[PDB]
Curated annotation (Swiss-Prot), chain A:
Upper lineage: Eukaryota, Fungi, Dikarya, Ascomycota, Saccharomycotina
Name of the protein in question: Small ribosomal subunit protein uS12A
Gene Ontology MF annotations: structural constituent of ribosome
Protein location: Cytoplasm
Origin species: Saccharomyces cerevisiae (strain ATCC 204508 / S288c) (Baker's yeast)
Similarity comment text for this entry: Belongs to the universal ribosomal protein uS12 family.
GO biological process, alphabetically ordered: maintenance of translational fidelity; maturation of SSU-rRNA from tricistronic rRNA transcript (SSU-rRNA, 5.8S rRNA, LSU-rRNA); regulation of translational fidelity; translation
Pfam families cross-referenced by the UniProt entry: Ribosom_S12_S23
SUPFAM superfamilies from the UniProt entry: Nucleic acid-binding proteins
Function: Component of the ribosome, a large ribonucleoprotein complex responsible for the synthesis of proteins in the cell. The small ribosomal subunit (SSU) binds messenger RNAs (mRNAs) and translates the encoded message by selecting cognate aminoacyl-transfer RNA (tRNA) molecules. The large subunit (LSU) contains the ribosomal catalytic site termed the peptidyl transferase center (PTC), which catalyzes the formation of peptide bonds, thereby polymerizing the amino acids delivered by tRNAs into a polypeptide chain.
Post-translational modification (record): Hydroxylation at Pro-63 affects translation termination efficiency. The stereochemistry of the 3,4-dihydroxyproline has not yet been determined.
InterPro entries referenced in this protein's UniProt entry, alphabetically: NA-bd_OB-fold, Ribosomal_uS12, Ribosomal_uS12_euk/arc
GO cellular component, one term: ribosome
Swiss-Prot record, chain B:
Cellular component, GO annotation: cytoplasm; cytosol; cytosolic small ribosomal subunit; nucleolus; nucleoplasm; small-subunit processome
Positions of the S5 DRBM domain: 43-106
GO biological process: cytoplasmic translation; positive regulation of translational fidelity; ribosomal subunit export from nucleus; rRNA processing; translation
Annotated protein name in UniProt: Small ribosomal subunit protein uS5
NCBIfam families: uS5_euk_arch
Swiss-Prot record, chain C:
Function as written in the Swiss-Prot or TrEMBL entry: Component of the ribosome, a large ribonucleoprotein complex responsible for the synthesis of proteins in the cell. The small ribosomal subunit (SSU) binds messenger RNAs (mRNAs) and translates the encoded message by selecting cognate aminoacyl-transfer RNA (tRNA) molecules. The large subunit (LSU) contains the ribosomal catalytic site termed the peptidyl transferase center (PTC), which catalyzes the formation of peptide bonds, thereby polymerizing the amino acids delivered by tRNAs into a polypeptide chain.
GO CC annotations, alphabetized: cytoplasmic stress granule; cytosol; cytosolic small ribosomal subunit
GO biological process terms on file: cytoplasmic translation
Organism whose genome encodes this protein: Saccharomyces cerevisiae (strain ATCC 204508 / S288c) (Baker's yeast)
Gene: RPS30A
Listed name of the protein: Small ribosomal subunit protein eS30A
Family (UniProt): Belongs to the eukaryotic ribosomal protein eS30 family.
Taxonomic classification: Eukaryota, Fungi, Dikarya, Ascomycota, Saccharomycotina
Top-level taxonomic group: Eukaryota
Modified residues (Phosphoserine): S15
Swiss-Prot record, chain E:
Chain's gene name: RPS21A
Protein name per UniProt: Small ribosomal subunit protein eS21A
Recorded GO MF terms: structural constituent of ribosome
Record function comment: Component of the ribosome, a large ribonucleoprotein complex responsible for the synthesis of proteins in the cell. The small ribosomal subunit (SSU) binds messenger RNAs (mRNAs) and translates the encoded message by selecting cognate aminoacyl-transfer RNA (tRNA) molecules. The large subunit (LSU) contains the ribosomal catalytic site termed the peptidyl transferase center (PTC), which catalyzes the formation of peptide bonds, thereby polymerizing the amino acids delivered by tRNAs into a polypeptide chain.
Keyword rRNA processing part of the UniProt annotation: yes
Extra remark: Present with 27400 molecules/cell in log phase SD medium. There are 2 genes for eS21 in yeast.
Cited InterPro entries: Ribosomal_eS21 (IPR001931), Ribosomal_eS21_CS (IPR018279), Ribosomal_eS21_sf (IPR038579)
Disulfide linkage: none
This protein's UniProt keywords: Acetylation, Cytoplasm, Ribonucleoprotein, Ribosomal protein, rRNA processing
GO CC terms: cytosol; cytosolic small ribosomal subunit
Location(s), subcellular: Cytoplasm
Family, as annotated: Belongs to the eukaryotic ribosomal protein eS21 family.
Positions of post-translational N-acetylmethionine modification: M1
Length: 144, 216, 60, 184, 87
RNA sequence: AUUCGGGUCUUGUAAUUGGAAUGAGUACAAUGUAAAUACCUUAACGAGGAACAAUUGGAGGGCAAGUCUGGUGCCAGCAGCCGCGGUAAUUCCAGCUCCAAUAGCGUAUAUUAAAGUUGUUGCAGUUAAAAAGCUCGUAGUUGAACUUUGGGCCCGGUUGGCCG
RNA sequence: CCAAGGACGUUUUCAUUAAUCAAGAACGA
RNA sequence: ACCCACUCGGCACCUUACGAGAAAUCAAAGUCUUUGGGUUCUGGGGGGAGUAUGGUCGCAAGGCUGAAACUUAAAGGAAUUG
RNA sequence: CUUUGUACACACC
């Protein structure tokens, strides 16, 4: 009779089986355990501000030979270390030292983006000015 | 010139059968394409995709192109052909030829109240090819053919204005979903409906009646 | 792993590119007039219809 | 803590962004009837989708249903009042057979074109928006007006405008001043 | 079938099998049309006068074409004691 | 129907030229308002381009639109995915051109559809993930057929139907 | 030697005593 | 005890495919988009990992239940040509 | 050259 019970008074069995098999998915368990609240670096938020600690020259994965020009920052609200990839060409000259940066995700819902290993975040704004306006010379970086 | 070799081809060359409906009425095997584009001059062709197929040998990889062609006129008659060939233009050429030999009719019906001309299918129907199942459901007027654009092209070449489609399986395989859709539109004339419950006097074959304009 | 690298090479091609100034063009009609321009130069000006209505060709 | 205003969205984007057939058809329609975006086509198709959903929900119930009779007679009365539906197509299923071109044919743009005052849809647009058009005795400057199958006998140029009297015009007065000082 | 007022529609009203009373599809290439000539009082058949029996591909493929042909031949009277209702 | 001559009527293109039409923006006044600010009216002023000048994202595929030009040469970088770049880059950096939405357009995060990848409708378990080693067995779920049927006699409603 | 079991045969008897089974229990190279 | 014919109940074997399947194949793995006879259990891409911890049984070895952080764009099944 | 096995496909280096 195709597995599951089909009786008119068997709704409880279907409900408890659906709960137990709902725990087998990935997004439902991630939501209900509060893993975004607990173990995420951002704490479940879309963006996060941070203080840049240093610069890294992260290699690109195989097959690709490049250096990805990332930075290591520390988040203000939690205080954990986070590697973020400075997006465009020549923008590493804008994010030098102890800057106040805004980080977002990559669009891979917390997974590594491309050939860059072990990063999850990109720098959006530095010192209150966006990197795209600085790259296109629309605005110009403030004092400190 | 044609010079057919079939009794059916000779009779349609003579002009004895003036419409294609006797062929499906008496289930005659359509055997040469010139019968089809003599009896149905209004059909157009479209080629959906050309995919390279590879046969690997000891010395390189032999390349051919598989071309699928859907032909048909926009009231009733649909054909589907699939042909692989070493040259691409021969692949569309043999594709339109094979699609001409596979012409089938469509049970077009009404979703409700039978007011005007038939716009949709008479019944729900399905087709399965490989892992792909395609289900067609009658739809109200002006709903359009809600379908992926390949099978949407197929049923707008068929003559349906509106239909609901459902799919299951690996529908990205284009040949399997086009063949499943062809089976689904072929099964419309397989279903027995209460308007067909009446008995018929079993008409005599044109292959027998006009047998002295035949091959012999 | 390869975490370090030559950070002095950043912005190489962006700096090495030659400055080319954007030429002065007459102003395109806008809004409804732009759609009028696209409609006229796609259908009644059907001039580039080479094999299958090719509208952005290369110089050949 | 006052009672909130109700508002709604009037358009709806299609599911597939980029396909050649739909883009071709809608830019053909926009060039034909003189629209400025695809948002007009989206709005009219949204209205037609609402109308078709209402007709489809009414047709599922049987005939002689009081709800079907009342709302169906109201809907065909409204659509034949506007002019999007002919007076002989009054069977609630030709409502399902409508197209967006019948809606697009009843705008004030194309009505000004069909009345012969403009000689183009774009001249109709710049005539309507520049307030030289009165549907009754009332000035309208909006092309998506949906005239009501009676008002087109009264569509004429504005009384308080050039091409309707009572003043020559702004730059006509400017040029009159120029030839007046040229006379002096 | 019909629409509202006349104008016969449904091109190609299909034939139906004389054994299982199912319709015969357009590409049912195993279906056959048995034509039996009838005799008028002289031992000789008349050209053009037939009785006609259509058999679908399914009943023919199962091997049950001959028993069904026995049944419809004995039902029309041209056969006498080959097929029995009681099996 | 007079050689390829004028072409009436056309549909677009111009380092071609004309008169018109109008609002954004000021503003006397009136209206508005508790008083104002705006709105709707309206004297007067207020388009010809270098003006009163529209962005955002992209052009290998998915997925609409470049084998065009110059630079870099597995570097810089691009890329949600596949992938591009190692001196002939349709993918990077720019110009030209084109494309899509448009006073809006992109990015991140969450969620919904797509998802018949939560499956009541509606999944799957031989070999792809998955039949508990087998049996007994409580709760739970499910459980053979059978008991008034048929026949008549009236009454009055709705859809019809010639009669209109 | 001891009890058990299937199938068959049956115009023998009971009368729905049943199917699958969380917990639990027996057996298990 | 054989033989013939039958029937019931078994372990099976051989041929086809109306049907199923992705195929190998299947009288069940059929009567499943024309989707519901009743019921028990299990699974939701691949590793980490049947690992850690917490319980529980065992003299012990171990047995049962059993994650997460993180990491990856494929692992995998059946067939065809070399 | 057939059959057989493969987790080989830049193919047993």
């Amino acid at each position: 009779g195709k597995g599951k019970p089909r009786g008119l008074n068997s709704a409880r069995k279907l409900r408890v089986h659906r709960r137990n098999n709902r725990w087998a998915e990935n997004n439902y368990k991630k939501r209900l355990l509060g893993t975004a609240f607990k173990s995420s670096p951002f704490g479940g938020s879309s963006h996060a501000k941070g203080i840049v600690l240093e610069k890294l020259g992260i290699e690109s994965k195989q097959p690709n030979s490049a250096i990805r020009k990332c930075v290591r920052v520390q988040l203000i609200k939690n205080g954990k270390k986070v590697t973020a990839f400075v997006p465009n060409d020549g923008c590493l000259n804008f994010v030098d030292e102890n800057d106040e940066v805004l980080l977002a995700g990559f669009g891979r819902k917390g997974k590594a983006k491309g050939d860059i290993p072990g990063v999850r975040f990109k720098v959006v704004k530095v010192s209150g000015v966006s990197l795209l306006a600085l790259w296109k010379e629309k605005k110009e970086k403030p004092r400190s | 010139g044609w010079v057919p070799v079939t009794k059916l081809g000779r009779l349609v060359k003579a002009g004895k059968i003036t419409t294609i409906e006797e062929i499906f009425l008496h289930s005659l095997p359509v055997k040469e394409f010139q019968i089809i584009d003599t009896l149905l001059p209004g059909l157009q062709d479209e080629v959906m995709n050309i995919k390279p197929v590879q046969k690997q040998t000891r010395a390189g990889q032999r390349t051919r192109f598989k071309a699928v062609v859907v032909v048909g006129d926009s009231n009733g008659h649909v054909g589907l052909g699939i042909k692989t060939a070493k040259e691409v233009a021969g692949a569309i050429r043999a594709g339109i030829i094979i699609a001409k030999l596979s012409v089938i009719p469509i049970r077009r019906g009404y979703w409700g109240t039978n007011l005007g001309q038939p716009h949709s299918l008479a019944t729900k129907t399905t087709g399965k090819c490989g892992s792909v199942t395609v289900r067609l459901i009658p739809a109200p007027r002006g709903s359009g053919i809600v379908a992926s654009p390949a099978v949407k092209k197929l049923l707008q070449l068929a003559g349906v204005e509106d239909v609901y489609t459902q799919s299951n399986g690996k529908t990205r395989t284009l040949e399997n979903t086009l063949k499943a859709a062809f089976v689904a539109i072929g099964n419309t004339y397989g279903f027995l409906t209460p308007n067909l419950w009446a008995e018929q006097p079993l008409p005599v074959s044109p292959l027998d009646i006009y047998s002295d304009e035949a091959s012999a | 792993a390869k975490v370090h690298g030559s950070l002095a090479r950043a912005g190489k091609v962006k700096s090495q590119t030659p400055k080319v100034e954007k030429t002065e063009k007459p102003k395109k009609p806008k809004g409804r007039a732009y759609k009028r321009l696209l409609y006229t130069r796609r259908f009644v000006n059907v001039t580039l219809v080479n094999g299958k209505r090719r509208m952005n060709p290369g110089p050949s | 803590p006052r009672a909130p205003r109700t508002y709604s969205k009037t358009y709806s984007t299609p599911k597939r962004p980029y396909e050649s057939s739909r883009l071709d058809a809608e830019l053909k329609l926009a060039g034909e009837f003189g629209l400025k975006n695809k948002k007009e086509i989206y709005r009219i198709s949204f209205q037609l989708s609402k109308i078709r959903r209402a007709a489809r929900d009414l047709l599922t119930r049987d005939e002689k249903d009081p709800k079907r009779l009342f709302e169906g007679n109201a809907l065909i009365r409204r659509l034949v009042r506007v002019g999007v539906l002919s007076e002989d197509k009054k069977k609630l299923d030709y409502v399902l057979a409508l197209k967006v071109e019948d809606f697009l044919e009843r705008r004030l743009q194309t009505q000004v074109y069909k009345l012969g005052l403009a000689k183009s849809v774009h001249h109709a647009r710049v005539l309507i928006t520049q307030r030289h058009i009165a549907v009754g005795k009332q000035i309208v400057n909006i092309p998506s007006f949906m005239v009501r199958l009676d008002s087109e006998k009264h569509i004429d140029f504005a009384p308080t405008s050039p091409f309707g009297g009572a003043r020559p015009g702004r730059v006509a007065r400017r040029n009159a001043a120029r030839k007046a000082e040229a006379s002096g | 079938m019909e629409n509202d007022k006349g104008q016969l529609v449904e091109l190609y009203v299909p034939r139906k099998c004389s054994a299982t009373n199912r319709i015969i599809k357009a590409d049912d290439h195993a279906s056959v049309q048995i034509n039996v000539a009838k005799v008028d009082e002289e031992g000789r058949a008349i050209p053009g006068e037939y009785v006609t029996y259509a058999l679908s591909g399914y009943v023919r493929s199962r091997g049950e074409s001959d028993d069904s042909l026995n049944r419809l031949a004995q039902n029309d009277g041209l056969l006498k004691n080959v097929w029995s209702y009681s099996r």
